[PDB]
Amino acid sequence: AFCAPPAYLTHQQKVLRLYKRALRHLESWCIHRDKYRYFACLMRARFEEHKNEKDMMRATQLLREAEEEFWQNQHPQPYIFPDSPGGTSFERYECYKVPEWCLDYWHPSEKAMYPDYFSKREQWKKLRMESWDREVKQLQEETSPDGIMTEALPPARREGDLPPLWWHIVTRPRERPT
Amino acid sequence: MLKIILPSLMLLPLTWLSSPKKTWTNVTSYSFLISLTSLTLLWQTDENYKNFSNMFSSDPLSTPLIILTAWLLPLMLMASQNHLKKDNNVLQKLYISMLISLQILLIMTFSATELIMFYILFEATLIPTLIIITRWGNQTERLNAGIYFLFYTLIGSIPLLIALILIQNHVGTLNLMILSFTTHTLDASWSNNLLWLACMMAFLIKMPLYGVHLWLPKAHVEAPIAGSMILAAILLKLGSYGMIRISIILDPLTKYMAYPFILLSLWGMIMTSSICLRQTDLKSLIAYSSVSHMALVIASIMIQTPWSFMGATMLMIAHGLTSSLLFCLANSNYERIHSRTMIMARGLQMVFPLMATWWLMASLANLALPPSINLMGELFITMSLFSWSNFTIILMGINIIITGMYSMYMIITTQRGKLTNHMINLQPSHTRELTLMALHMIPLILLTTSPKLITGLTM
Amino acid sequence: DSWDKDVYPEPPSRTPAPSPQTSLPNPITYLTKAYDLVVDWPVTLVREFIERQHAKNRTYYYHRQYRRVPDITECKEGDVLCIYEAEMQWRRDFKVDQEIMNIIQERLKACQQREGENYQQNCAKELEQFTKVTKAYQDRYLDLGAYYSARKCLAKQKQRMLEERKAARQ
Amino acid sequence: MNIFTTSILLIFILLLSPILISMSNLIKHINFPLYTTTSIKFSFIISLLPLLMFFHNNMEYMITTWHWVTMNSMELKMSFKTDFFSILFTSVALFVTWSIMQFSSWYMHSDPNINRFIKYLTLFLITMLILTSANNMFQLFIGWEGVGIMSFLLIGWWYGRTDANTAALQAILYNRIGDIGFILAMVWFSLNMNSWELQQIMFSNNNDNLIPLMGLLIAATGKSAQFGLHPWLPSAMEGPTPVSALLHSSTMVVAGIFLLVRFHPLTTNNNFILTTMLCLGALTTLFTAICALTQNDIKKIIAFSTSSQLGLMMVTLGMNQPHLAFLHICTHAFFKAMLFMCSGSIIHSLADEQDIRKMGNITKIMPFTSSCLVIGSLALTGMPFLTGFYSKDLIIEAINTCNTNAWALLITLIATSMTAMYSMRIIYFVTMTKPRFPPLISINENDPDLMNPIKRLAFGSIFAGFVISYNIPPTSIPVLTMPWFLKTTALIISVLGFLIALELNNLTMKLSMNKANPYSSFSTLLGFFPSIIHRITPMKSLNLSLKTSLTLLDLIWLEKTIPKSTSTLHTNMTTLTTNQKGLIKLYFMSFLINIILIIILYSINL
Amino acid sequence: SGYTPDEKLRLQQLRELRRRWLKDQELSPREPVLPKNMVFKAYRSSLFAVSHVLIPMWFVHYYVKYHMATKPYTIVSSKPRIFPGDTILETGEVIPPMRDFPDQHH
């Protein structure tokens, strides 16, 4: 979530993703902790015994066969953490994740209910206003004239500067707003 | 009727003589008073009809339409007085004059006792809505929409004029009560079949019938909010009222001549509900929902059952109210985000809670939640259609299922879900538009409380 | 009670006397006595006050009666005056017949609820009355259409009488 | 005759009062959940009064409060048929909803819209009591649709969740198919008996009622989630746990069973309707027990348990035993209310964690909740002289000892054994074995707002079936002369199911991976019905809509036929007529042609 | 592989600003700036029972007796169970008992 995906997944990343998914489905089958630990050590032994492959064409073939085996032997209802997608509590508080710009449309009475918070909000707004021009200049400088471009973003590289496009990251709503 | 017509006429000098800082206030207040005056037509303590004059009369069918028109005029002013703030004063007064002229001509059309005067006021109502759509519409396609609307209606209405002149030559007066009493049974020849088609096709065009409904979605999309309100809430009902008025002298050949139009209505309401399921434009969705509901009204009027006529009248009033309310809510979102895309604004329940409540209530009215007059009309239409043929229940059930589906799909995709946080220009709410939603919803509640007012001619 | 048992018949109630075998007190009797003393007494007091205020300001209203205008059978065709009078009289009688059917149906529902488990036997006369008035209503008003009128009712009656006369030939 | 009607209308007024308080702008100064809970408990007491009256004298009531409208010969009036069914279900629903309101006050804490949640629950209770107590089918429909819409809102309570919105939408869809059946029945009765009143329906008992009974069966299938229209209930577990409990466990889902109980005098004279109800109920209870065998979400397990019990009630209606079905409605309402409340307490103590694979040792770490969960499981399986004895075992005896379908009987017995099996699955994987939850222990079930409603539902689930069944007026004469294997059948198969499931759970404890089988895949993936149907029917419907209706008709062919073809024809004609060369030689040659043609026309006309 | 120095420094700075923003999300102790108990049985249930129950019971009973019982078929009840040996209150007659019950085996 906090990192952007690359153009393609390398072979090592595909193998590690398969290993983690296989362990999760193995725990979904095993339920009990001791049984899960036994069969997870067996799965780790399988991955270790196929680890040192040098041809890499046979390694891709083994990865394909292992993926076929996983799709044949996966749990129909694997365990999902509640906050994870497909879980029971996933996107539950999106109805409460109100974006911060409605305080701009708040009435002066409602602002008068919270004086100090709105003063600090104005300070954040002024900081954003200066940093926007600074970071637009930085992003224009940092952009390659031609070639390969990814979704990664530069940090602040000088004193008294903020990272570009920091507003929607820093001022995002909390995961438990209430 | 003159006591309603005359001050509505005097609204125009009030509009042109009021100060620019007082025009909206004065015209809105006096149009509300006009509606309150129009409420005196409900004083019907007898089986007779309130024949006020030799050219104006009131009916259990005409009265709810007149009251709805007089009630819709101030609501149209409130709906339209926001997108005209950056507008010239004389153009604002001209727009108000167009709305007032529409209200006057529609009241006269519903209160007319003579079919030639009915046709003259029919075309008289055809003019200023075309002017409104063409002049104050937003996109480029308003000109094509106005042409489609105008010429669908005109090609419908010309054989209606020929048929009315023929019936006047045959009978003598073309007066509604005289025709109703000295009705003669037609001998079912090809000439009488053509006469039937001539006097029914204008109203079927303006209903609209399926296959000839193509003017309605683009006209409602390209029209301004007041034009969409007056169209979807009065003019289709004007077509239905014309069908009910003219069908009394078409016996007996309407019994077999109604067959293609009933099939067109049922399958067209299914098709248009499917279009609502797959439609990317909110105003287009509301327009096609209007097409399906008016197809139900067409089928009831064609089968000519007293239950069908009552359900037709109740569905006319209920659909006028709920379609104007849906158009006003869609126009509030359009004035917010400057787009009509169905999927663009999603999480509006978070930012607009009371407006989401109005959305939910409007959609529940649209899918005929009991005991509302929407369900009353739809249920009695279903009863009469099942009496006409037991196999119509399949088409009715499919239409009801898809109706609930597109209504709840509209609610979920416009209010529920995650909020489109990029829409920084979401002003909280206008008391004007919240008042507009309330002034739509409350008469629905009151007519639900007392449904005897809108039963119509048969009961 | 503004209603009368001639048009809303009701059999006299036959309640049995209480015969409590148990020695336990009856909470229903305790609650009904308490409910009377707490609720029924102030309600009947304020209702008596309202009734005496109405007696102080008493007014009367009457039930309108219409004389019988000549029937449409003696109205010449094309004479819209007498045709209008006969049509209005026919619509008035149609509404009266609708309310007569409502009265009969309400009477039948009351019979069914009163009898309960014995409605298949003890509502025989109510069901017979409902069937007879339904048959008469179907003979006079059915299949007229949305534009029902005295002329259409007369045409239907003439057709039915012609069919009956032709059946009576053989 | 006044205190009875006063108590009924006072139930309705006490229910309507918190709605007016909610819209009356004084919520910010009062404790609205506590006020509504007190309103529900006072409504329950005021409903206990006609319960005692009907237990005394068996008075059967019909109350016409308000006249709505008159349309020729149909007099639509607001009427309530205060029956045995209406009174007993009103009392049970009010007791359950009192427990639900107090549990909601505990559970939906740190929720900004707890007042809206409570108001929605109150609106659902009002519509449910309208549906239960309605005398005419139109008012029945009002309660039916209000219940459906409040179900939609309460499923889509967390409206930022796309899956919650989808579940609410599909519940609306299946309920609308049920509405189509209901409308068919209502229209048939309006046309053939001139009323929607139950008394004229009773007079309609003596003719062919195949079409209205089929419509009522379709409505009951849609509302009670029988086979074909089932999956919206376990999908509808997406809402919060008090919603799940009250709506889909005790009150709403028994409305189709209540409808068929209501129209049982018509149903007794139609053998085909009885046979198809028996077959449908047996099929859905077997299928839903099979689906419940291998689930992991505890709410999903008890939801499929609810659907299996609804199938059992449909079987009981397939036999001519409607009163046993209503008794099972009440007893099952108690069981599922307490079971869902215990599961919700487990979930809140384990921090919104819902599947049984990360639970364990609940008997020792949450003793009160474990005790009440065991009580609920035993009373659901039908341990003797609990609340499940007096309905479920009479149903099993009736199906054993009456002439019915053989396969329906066999799969009903197998479904009862599998009910014991999945109850043992719940007990094992939750209350037994070793802990599997994350280490941070935040269990705190010491709140009286949690303890007291569970205690009241436990007293219900122990004694309520006994009290009710001994106060029931004798009807539907049971048979008691049967062999020993037809008398102890339910107890024997319940014990066998418990032992078989215990052995299977110990085998899962055994350290060995086994290859998965199509039977277990079929059970876990809900019989492939949600995946297959919910992927093929929306795809075909929406694809047909866009690819045929909108595009092909409106945006293509109606435009090609009427307006564009008319414009093309007139454009071609105006080009052909205004293609002049501007030469007066050609114009005068045309004039000469006109002169010749006029002379010819005159010469032939003469 | 691990973080690049680019992404690591960006995440560190973004997280520090997130800490500052969440710290500023706190409330001052004066926030927000807003412009007869007896016992539960004797007082709390008393006024609620006399307000939300008793007065609605009065209004409901008034409507039932003086606007519903005054109408013909509004409140219709089934006939009471009449068993042999009972005495009718309204009529005053005692219906005869049943026969001699020849079976006395259980």
Ligand SMILES: CCCCCCCCCCCCCCCCCC(=O)OC[C@H](COP(=O)([O-])OCC[N+](C)(C)C)OC(=O)CCCCCCCCCCCCCCCCC
């Ligand atoms: C919106 C739809 C528009 C098209 C359909 C319109 C209706 C179609 C059926 C009716 C025929 C056309 C209208 C006739 C109006 C008068 C009817 C009448 O009085 O009938 C009785 C009369 C007969 O008169 P009569 O009733 O006195 O008959 C005398 C009978 N005896 C002797 C026994 C007493 O019918 C006609 O005169 C009809 C002649 C019509 C000829 C012209 C038709 C032109 C084309 C029509 C459509 C044009 C627009 C669409 C173009 C294409 C667009 C895609």
Ligand SMILES: CCCCCCCCCCCCCCCCCC(=O)OC[C@H](COP(=O)(O)OCCN)OC(=O)CCCCCCCCCCCCCCCCC
């Ligand atoms: C022994 C005898 C046995 C007899 C067996 C008889 C079986 C009969 C079966 C009848 C019912 C079949 C049709 C049911 C359709 C249900 C569709 C539905 O609700 O799909 C839900 C689905 C998304 O839900 P899902 O994917 O399951 O879960 C979300 C998890 N992320 O998808 C959606 O939410 C899509 C949104 C809706 C899209 C529009 C749908 C319009 C449907 C119109 C149907 C019109 C015809 C209906 C005919 C009914 C006939 C009964």
Ligand SMILES: CCCCCCCCCCCCCCCCCC(=O)OC[C@H](COP(=O)(O)OCCN)OC(=O)CCCCCCCCCCCCCCCCC
């Ligand atoms: C199921 C029911 C079936 C039966 C009923 C069928 C009939 C239904 C009703 C008819 C509806 C017709 C609609 C006509 C209007 C739509 C056509 C249109 O708008 O054309 C526009 C086009 C000019 O476009 P323009 O604006 O120049 O360019 C676009 C951007 N610059 O315009 C042009 O290019 C030329 C436009 C010509 C005028 C069209 C309107 C008048 C038509 C007169 C018809 C005469 C009929 C008799 C003909 C003689 C006898 C055969």
